[PDB]
Design a protein around this ligand. Structure first.
Ligand SMILES: CCCCCCCCCCCCCCCCCC(=O)OC[C@H](COP(=O)([O-])OCC(O)COP(=O)([O-])OC[C@@H](COC(=O)CCCCCCCCCCCCCCCCC)OC(=O)CCCCCCCCCCCCCCCCC)OC(=O)CCCCCCCCCCCCCCCCC
Ligand SMILES: CCCCCCCCCCCCCCCCCC(=O)OC[C@H](COP(=O)([O-])OCC(O)COP(=O)([O-])OC[C@@H](COC(=O)CCCCCCCCCCCCCCCCC)OC(=O)CCCCCCCCCCCCCCCCC)OC(=O)CCCCCCCCCCCCCCCCC
Ligand code: BCL
Ligand code: BCL
Ligand SMILES: CC[C@H]1c2cc3[nH]c4c(c3C)C(=O)[C@H](C(=O)OC)c4c3nc(cc4[nH]c(cc(n2)[C@@H]1C)c(C(C)=O)c4C)[C@@H](C)[C@@H]3CCC(=O)OC/C=C(/C)CCC[C@H](C)CCC[C@H](C)CCCC(C)C
Ligand SMILES: CC[C@H]1c2cc3[nH]c4c(c3C)C(=O)[C@H](C(=O)OC)c4c3nc(cc4[nH]c(cc(n2)[C@@H]1C)c(C(C)=O)c4C)[C@@H](C)[C@@H]3CCC(=O)OC/C=C(\C)CCC[C@H](C)CCC[C@H](C)CCCC(C)C
Ligand SMILES: CCCCCC/C=C\CCCCCCCCCC(=O)O[C@H](COC(=O)CCCCCCCCCCCCCCC)COP(=O)(O)OC[C@@H](O)CO
Ligand SMILES: COC(C)(C)C/C=C/C(C)=C/C=C/C(C)=C/C=C/C(C)=C/C=C\C=C(C)\C=C\C=C(C)\C=C\C=C(C)\C=C\CC(C)(C)OC
Ligand SMILES: CCCCCCCCCCCCO[C@@H]1O[C@H](CO)[C@@H](O[C@H]2O[C@H](CO)[C@@H](O)[C@H](O)[C@H]2O)[C@H](O)[C@H]1O
Ligand SMILES: CCCCCCCCCCCCO[C@@H]1O[C@H](CO)[C@@H](O[C@H]2O[C@H](CO)[C@@H](O)[C@H](O)[C@H]2O)[C@H](O)[C@H]1O
Ligand SMILES: [Fe+3]
Ligand SMILES: [Mg+2]
Lengths: 48, 45, 46, 278, 274, 46, 318, 46, 46, 46, 46, 46, 46, 47
């Protein structure tokens, strides 16, 4: 059927979900920038 | 037992999610191609 | 094309789609990890 | 030969250990075949099998053991093979005629084999006292009295994916010929087995809507479209399903009456089932 | 002679072929058309086996009807060079298939489901894998196993060591797991039913409550009266099926040593550690 | 000797006799195919 | 188009069954019990509760100690790498003592840890035997399950303890590893000349194959007669319903003889435990009173003879 | 897309995501440790 | 030809077609990966 | 994020967090033991 | 933090803690037995 | 510390302690028997 | 200390103690039979 | 609790301690005889 959950409460979960996902990806992107600064993972034509 | 309004709303969630996922994957394949093209020539890569 | 969801159950189609696309994406990523020209961690010449 | 294990110039310990096990295996095989002969024995040799044209009893080999006493929970020491079941079988006048007088000829039913308990429609002689749990509750009871049970093992599965956790209450019943027999009104559950056993239905489609009939679950194919398809019997044949003595209980005998009637449909529900493919 | 309840069940119908012509009992056996066929096939194959035995040795264990040479390919061979084996194979296959069709006639007559003939069809599938399907894929009837009590044990030994360590066959480890687990389940199932119906002397026959309570007391789960027979059938049929899989992939789909097959596991990028 | 049919049903003895004949004919024909002298299609010499 | 009794279509859930009351000295059961939809399709849905008493706790403690010793030695052999542990999971093992130690107590890293793991594993399975025995007696049941388990224990003890003790060295025993104990199984057959020719290995396989045959026959028959409540087998033993008669008639008409609802479980019980008992006897015979099983088979005229196909090899060191 | 949570139970989606993320991060970290170049505790040179 | 759907359930047909298409597409791709001419990731030369 | 406990059952989440962190802490410590430069009990030069 | 003992049965928490400490202590002691430097029963020099 | 017995069941703590100490005592005595410096039955030099 | 017997069944404790003694005696006697100093039936010298 | 009064519990304990003492005392004598035979505590040099 449907999840028993108010139309406004569903909007509330989504807002926190998209803020938590955005913060999770924001930390992940910085972590990736720090790792590429350590050792880049896309090799060139001749390799590393 | 799914109405026309429910079906339209589902396909909007499907449309938005399908659009982002394809749009990102196409960008992934352009960057992947710009790195190392995967279709060899007569002599190879 | 919204009528697709008067045919399938959309709730399970999306769950099935995620599981299938996860398996396929790991399949392709692992396959490239086994090749020589597309193993980005190995970094062999191209 | 020589070495550890030699018993003679030819015999050795492993070989004689093997023959020792042969003697045990025989004694176990004989013992097992005797335990096999506590139901349906001694064999009833009919007159038309013997050259003297007299009925007899064959023990077989090994001969059956002595009668075995099962003390029961309610304080009743029953003996096996049970005397009342043997006496019912030997005295029941079958409503069937042998297709030939020689031994091994199949019976061809005279009247209606489904209501007469012939072949796949047959029933055993069982107790008429409804079974009880260890704690004394009614073992097989419908959900209207067994109110502690609710249909559906998983509430979330029953609510969001009811196709795989169905509730057949209110479902239409169809026979093997696609005709509507009625509506499922209740479900009967075994308090010990924790399973549905019967789907009580009314006869609103082929008889009185106030009539109640039990459909065994293993004969019911609970579909995904709110229809229960019974391949055993024609929809019109749901009217002759044996009725319960009491609307809220079923004895083990009535279980054999009801499952027996549906099982008989496998051969007799429609013409041609008895007939071979070719 | 019949069981004292047997008479009412002996009715007409349920056949797939033969109709009334073979629809009768000889003693306890239902005959049917597939019983006559399974009799002709079985007697033919057994008598042909004894003829093959008379040409080498009558010692019961040393009797052996061997398949033809691999050089024969799929051709039918001379009788004393594996043609006798090939006839016995088609006789045994027919004997097995008519046995299952006959059990299907018996199933319908007693109003039972076809679980027994189908469960036997898995066993027939494994034999068909051993003598037809795998020899076909490899390209010679000589890949089948010889018909001898001790000569087919050397076939199992040598075919197993054709892959240098047959224990590492992934489908064989699965089939062995299903065989060990099903006899474990059979010990528990047989024992629990005997334990209830035969309690300590002076105790009443117990209930299905005690059966569920016993295994919930021992392992914390009980599969129930119905579950034990589904699982029991499931474990034994998977035992047969994965037997068929393990042997059909040994040679047609793997020609190296089975331990080498696990090279993919040793090379998984997640846990290479080098 | 006609009374043998007051004991055995003609349908069953004929099914058993014919099954016996079919087994017997095949066994003897096949045994001859096994021998070098009587394998007529093999066509050895004497 | 008929229902095949393979999955339970309609399920009904009630309150958790707390089990039959125990005597007023047993430990309380656990309080944790939940219902599983997935398990309810195959059969009973309830998971838990579980009893744990003196024997259960001590069996678990002895077993955990055994598993920790095996696991830590396994992990130590790959230099403590969890990644290398997964890579080598089937290959690692706790290795038995080398032959030079005989039956003495070897140092921890030279089979000593193996001997401790084997001792605690033996204690846990023996206590588990007492647990299976007492749980049956606490319910007023027969001890059939425990003695069937005892039969499996005896093969386990014959393989790992009694036969290595009869041989005079812990080296003969089996290491705690997945592929290594398969290596032990093959090498055992190589060493004593093709265990196929061991007659009690033949009988062991007869009852093992006959156990799968029996469970397939019995399980299929109970599902086929499920339309007549065959799976309620206790009711059919005390009150022979039509399902018990159709099951017996089905096999009487098929192979000429049948069993009863009760005797089928005696056939299956004995086939299960004879498989493991002839297994133990066969293991105890080899090495002790039979050196080479093929040579034993030649002596007793069971080895097939093979005509010439190749030029026979000759031992150069003859 | 707020309606996505009127269909899918938030707890099961979050448990599913968390299980995927835990397995995926463990698998990525393990794959990196398996390579010579990105094993940060193996201390190799490039 | 629209009468085809009067006799066949559209969900069952589309599920069956997609399972056929997915498996067939996988098998053709994997067959091309094992050849020496159409192994595109392997980068074989003609 | 106190609303997280109106979605996730806090009693089960706390237990599974401790169980999960037990596996992860043991795993990380074991990984460091396996490396040469971070096995503190072996004491290799850094 | 005291409200934890209303959420859980303290008997269960203690049993779980002790069961964990017993396994952890045994794992640690076995680890030290594995190394050369901290094997106290082996008595190897530094 | 008698309040411990209003939390834990003294009856089943006593049984558990005895069986737990039994497992540990056998384990330790057997570990010592498997060392050269403390197998008091082998009596190797100290 | 006599209050033990209100807490436990004397039959159970006696069976438990006796089963522990029998196994302990069996283990110790075997351990002595495996050494070269306390194997009395072997007659090895000191 | 189990079906023992404070008296039956004491009667069991007295016999239990008597049996335990006698079993231990016999074992102690067995241990003195064994030590007289061959001691099991080695010196720094061994046996
Ligand atoms: C350890 C491992 C190694 C060893 C493994 C085992 C060795 C190999 C397998 C051997 C096992 C099978 C041997 C017997 C087969 C069963 C036959 C049978 O009826 O058993 C009776 C026997 C008990 O006898 P009974 O049924 O009580 O006899 C009662 C009266 O005699 C009943 O009287 P009645 O009126 O029934 O008398 C009948 C009489 C009357 O005959 C007539 O008048 C015929 C007239 C017609 C014209 O003759 C017949 O009609 C029947 C004869 C056979 C007819 C066959 C026709 C079949 C047609 C095609 C169907 C396919 C088959 O059951 C067994 O002993 C068999 C099981 C023993 C072995 C168990 C498995 C061991 C596995 C170990 C592991
Ligand atoms: C070295 C190899 C041996 C190493 C063995 C170590 C492991 C021992 C476990 C093996 C036995 C497991 C099965 C025993 C069993 O049936 O337990 C149920 C049964 C349940 O007892 P319950 O709860 O008091 O029963 C209540 C009611 O009576 C309810 O009881 P019920 O009515 O269900 O029980 C009646 C049961 C009675 O069952 C028993 O009394 C136990 C079975 C007796 C023989 C067991 C020996 C099996 C192992 C040796 C077999 C191969 C040896 C071959 C030669 C060497 C190679 O029925 C039988 O008679 C079955 C035996 C078959 C007939 C005798 C065949 C021998 C004739 C051939 C020899 C002469 C020619 O447990 C016992 O009676 C104690 C068995 C202790 C066996 C110790 C060995
Ligand atoms: C906040 C909102 C939710 C979310 C809400 C939605 C909604 C709403 C939808 C999606 C849908 C999708 N989401 Mg989402 N999704 C989220 C975030 C993500 C993220 C991410 C990294 O953040 C990813 C990668 C995805 C990915 C996906 C795709 C699975 C899908 C869109 C493509 C599509 O059209 O599938 C379609 C593709 C198929 C149906 C093919 C089916 C796959 C089959 C089974 C694979 C067969 C081949 C395979 C190889 C078989 C393997 C066998 C081998 C031999 C072993 N989502 C977040 C968590 N998402 C859409 C969807 O599910 O479409 C049905 C959709 O409607
Ligand atoms: C050294 C050799 C290798 C090895 C090489 C092989 C080879 C080769 C094979 C196996 C096969 C099997 N191996 Mg292995 N295997 C080894 C060691 C083991 C060990 C062990 C103790 O280590 C075990 C437990 C097993 C277990 C198994 C099973 C999984 C399987 C056999 C069961 C089966 O096929 O049922 C199937 C049952 C049948 C096929 C019976 C057919 C029944 C028919 C339909 C009816 C016959 C009726 C009859 C004629 C009636 C008689 C007449 C009446 C009685 C009157 N192997 C060693 C390591 N193994 C076999 C397999 O899986 O094939 C399918 C196989 O071919
Ligand atoms: C797949 C799961 C397991 C299984 C299942 C199973 N077997 C079954 C069934 C089922 C469900 C039956 O219903 C059917 C039955 O009715 O059993 C009583 C059967 C059966 N399984 C049997 C045997 C059997 N099953 C085996 C295995 C297994 N059966 C699996 C482990 C084995 C093994 C492992 O070796 C054997 C020997 C029979 C007792 C019976 C089938 C009887 C049958 O088919 O009879 C036909 C007529 C005959 C007399 C057969 C012989 C006819 C031939 C022409 C001659 C012999 C040829 C053969 C090639 C000789 C080979 C000998 C050498 C190998 C030594
Ligand atoms: C007739 C012979 C066949 C047979 C029979 C048989 N086996 C049996 C039995 C029987 C009759 C039982 O009664 C017994 C049983 O329990 O059955 C369910 C058993 C059994 N057979 C088993 C295994 C087994 N049987 C096998 C074989 C066979 N069993 C034969 C083929 C094999 C094979 C093929 O090798 C195996 C591996 C066990 C599952 C079980 C007996 C279990 C046992 O003895 O366990 C001892 C204790 C331990 C190992 C302790 C460790 C266990 C846990 C890790 C402890 C958990 C601690 C804590 C509670 C939780 C911690 C985690 C927290 C996060 C919560
Ligand atoms: C992405 C962001 C920006 C990319 C925009 C497009 C740039 C394309 C040309 C890049 C020029 C810069 C460059 O050339 O930088 C190169 C990096 O890889 C390169 O090409 C860059 C290749 C980028 C694409 C590869 C990544 C594919 C992404 C897939 C996405 C998956 C889903 C998200 C490295 O060069 P070299 O000297 O050989 O290094 C030698 C290496 O051993 C050390 O680095
Ligand atoms: C690090 O790991 C942690 C702690 C995280 C947990 C993980 C544990 C893991 C993963 C463990 C993995 C275990 C595995 C895979 C084990 C595999 C075991 C197998 C396949 C075993 C198979 C056969 C083994 C047998 C049959 C062993 C037999 C040994 C016996 C019977 C020993 C008997 C010994 C006795 C009775 C001892 C006697 C000692 C006496 C006292 C007599 O000596 C004087
Ligand atoms: C109702 C069932 C109907 C029967 C079904 C039969 C299916 C199984 C047979 C499939 C076809 C087998 O095909 C078989 O191939 C082999 C090739 O080695 C042929 O053999 C042929 O070539 C070989 C050499 O290759 C010659 O030595 C031989 O003289 C010649 O006959 C057989 O003549 C043919 O029978
Ligand atoms: C699909 C595989 O189907 C199977 O393929 C193999 C190889 O193609 C065939 O085998 C065929 O080629 C092999 C090649 O070595 C020959 O030795 C063999 O005599 C021949 O029959 C099988 O006869 C066929 O049934
Ligand atoms: Fe059963
Ligand atoms: Mg090894």
């Amino acid at each position: 059927s449907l999840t028993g959950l108010s139309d406004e409460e569903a909007k509330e979960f989504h807002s926190i979900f998209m803020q938590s996902f955005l913060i999770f990806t924001a930390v992940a992107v910085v972590a990736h920038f720090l790792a590429w600064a350590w050792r880049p993972w896309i090799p060139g034509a001749e390799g590393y | 037992n799914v109405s026309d309004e429910e079906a339209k709303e589902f396909h909007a969630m499907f449309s938005q999610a399908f659009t982002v996922y394809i749009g990102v994957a196409v960008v992934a394949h352009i960057l992947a191609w710009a790195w190392r093209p995967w279709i060899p020539g007569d002599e190879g890569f | 094309m919204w009528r697709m969801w008067k045919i399938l159950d959309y709730r399970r189609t999306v769950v099935l789609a995620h599981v299938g696309m996860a398996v396929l994406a790991l399949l392709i990523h692992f396959i490239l990890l086994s090749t020589e020209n597309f193993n980005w961690l190995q970094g062999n010449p191209y | 030969m020589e070495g550890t294990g030699a018993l003679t110039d030819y015999m050795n310990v492993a070989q004689m250990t093997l023959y020792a096990f042969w003697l045990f295996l025989a004694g176990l095989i004989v013992y097992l075949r005797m335990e096999d002969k506590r139901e349906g024995y001694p064999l009833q040799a009919e007159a038309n099998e013997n050259c003297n044209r007299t009925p007899e009893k064959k023990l077989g080999f090994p001969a059956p053991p002595s009668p075995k006493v099962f003390k029961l929970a309610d304080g009743r020491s029953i003996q096996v093979p049970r005397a009342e079941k043997t006496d019912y079988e030997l005295n029941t006048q079958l409503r069937a005629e042998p297709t030939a007088p020689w031994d091994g000829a199949p019976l061809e039913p005279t009247g209606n084999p489904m209501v007469d308990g012939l072949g796949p429609a047959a029933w055993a002689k069982r107790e008429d006292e409804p079974e009880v749990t260890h704690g004394g509750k009614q073992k097989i009871c419908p959900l209207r009295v067994a109110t502690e049970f609710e249909v559906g093992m998983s509430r979330d599965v029953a609510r969001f994916w009811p196709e795989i956790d169905p509730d057949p209450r209110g479902y239409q019943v169809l026979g093997c010929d696609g005709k509507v027999a009625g509506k499922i009104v209740d479900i009967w559950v075994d308090r010990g087995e924790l399973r549905p056993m019967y789907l009580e239905m009314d006869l609103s489609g082929v008889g009185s809507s106030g009539d109640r009939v039990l459909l065994p679950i293993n004969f019911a194919r609970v579909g995904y479209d709110s229809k229960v398809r019974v391949n055993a019997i024609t929809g019109q044949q749901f009217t002759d399903v044996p009725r319960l003595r009491e609307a809220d209980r079923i004895s083990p005998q009535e279980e054999d009456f009801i499952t027996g009637y549906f099982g008989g449909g496998v051969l007799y529900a429609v013409p041609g089932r008895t007939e071979p493919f070719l | 002679a019949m069981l004292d309840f047997e008479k009412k069940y002996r009715v007409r119908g349920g056949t797939l072929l033969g109709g009334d012509l073979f629809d009768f009992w000889i003693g306890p056996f239902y005959v049917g058309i597939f019983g006559v066929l399974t009799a002709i096939f079985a007697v033919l194959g057994t008598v042909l086996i004894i003829y093959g035995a008379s040409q080498d040795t009558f010692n019961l264990w040393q009797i052996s009807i061997a398949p033809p040479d691999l050089s024969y390919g799929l051709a039918l061979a001379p009788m004393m060079e594996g043609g006798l084996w090939q006839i016995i194979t088609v006789c045994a296959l027919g004997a097995f298939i008519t046995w299952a069709l006959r059990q299907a006639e018996i199933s319908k007559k007693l109003g039972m489901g076809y679980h027994v003939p189908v469960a036997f069809a898995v066993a027939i599938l494994a034999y068909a894998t051993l003598v037809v399907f795998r020899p076909l894929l490899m390209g010679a009837w000589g890949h089948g196993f010889p018909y001898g009590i001790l000569s087919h044990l050397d076939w199992v030994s040598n075919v197993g060591y054709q892959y240098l360590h047959f224990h590492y066959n992934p489908a064989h480890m699965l089939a062995v797991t299903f065989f060990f687990t099903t006899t474990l389940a059979l010990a528990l199932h047989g024992g629990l039913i005997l334990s209830v119906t035969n309690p300590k002397k002076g105790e009443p026959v117990k209930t299905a409550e005690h059966e569920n309570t016993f295994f919930r007391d021992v392992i914390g789960y009980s599969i129930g009266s119905l579950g034990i027979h589904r699982l029991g059938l499931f474990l034994a049929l998977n035992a047969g099926f994965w037997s068929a899989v393990c042997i059909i992939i040994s040679g047609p789909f793997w020609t190296r040593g089975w331990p080498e097959w696990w090279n993919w596991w040793l090379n998984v990028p997640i846990w290479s550690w080098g | 000797m006609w009374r043998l049919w007051k004991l055995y049903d003609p349908r069953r003895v004929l099914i058993g006799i014919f099954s016996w004949l079919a087994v017997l004919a095949l066994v003897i024909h096949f045994i001859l195919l096994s021998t070098d002298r009587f394998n007529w299609v093999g066509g050895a010499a004497v | 188009a008929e229902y095949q009794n393979i999955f339970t279509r309609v399920q009904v859930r009630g309150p958790t069954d707390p089990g039959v009351e125990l005597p007023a000295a047993d430990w309380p059961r656990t309080k944790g019990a939940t219902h599983s939809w997935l398990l309810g399709k195959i059969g009973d849905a309830q998971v838990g509760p579980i009893y744990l008493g003196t024997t259960g706790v001590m069996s678990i403690l002895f077993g955990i100690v055994s598993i920790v010793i095996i696991g830590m030695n396994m992990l130590a052999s790959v230099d403590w790498s969890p990644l290398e542990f997964i890579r080598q999971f089937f290959w690692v093992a706790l290795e038995p003592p080398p032959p030079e130690y005989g039956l003495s107590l070897p140092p921890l890293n030279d089979g000593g840890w193996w001997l401790i793991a084997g001792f605690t594993l033996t204690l846990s399975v023996l206590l588990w035997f007492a647990r299976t025995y007492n749980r049956a007696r606490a319910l007023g049941l027969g001890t059939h399950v425990a003695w069937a388990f005892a039969a499996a224990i005896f093969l386990f003890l014959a393989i790992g303890f009694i036969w290595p003790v009869l041989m005079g060295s812990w080296a003969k025993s089996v290491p705690f590893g997945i592929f290594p104990h398969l290596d032990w199984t093959t090498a055992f057959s190589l060493r004593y000349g093709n265990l196929y020719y061991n007659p009690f290995h033949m009988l062991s396989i007869v009852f093992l194959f006959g156990s799968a045959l029996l469970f397939a026959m019995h399980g299929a028959t109970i599902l086929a007669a499920g339309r007549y409540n065959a799976e309620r087998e206790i009711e059919q033993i005390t009150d022979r319903g039509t399902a018990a008669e159709r099951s017996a008639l089905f096999w009487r008409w098929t192979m000429g003889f049948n069993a009863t609802m009760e005797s089928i479980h005696r056939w299956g019980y004995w086939f299960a435990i004879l498989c493991v008992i002839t297994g133990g006897i066969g293991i105890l015979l080899t090495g002790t009173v039979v050196e080479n099983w093929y040579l034993w088979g030649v002596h007793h005229g069971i080895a097939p003879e093979y005509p010439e196909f190749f030029t026979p090899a000759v031992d150069p060191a003859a």
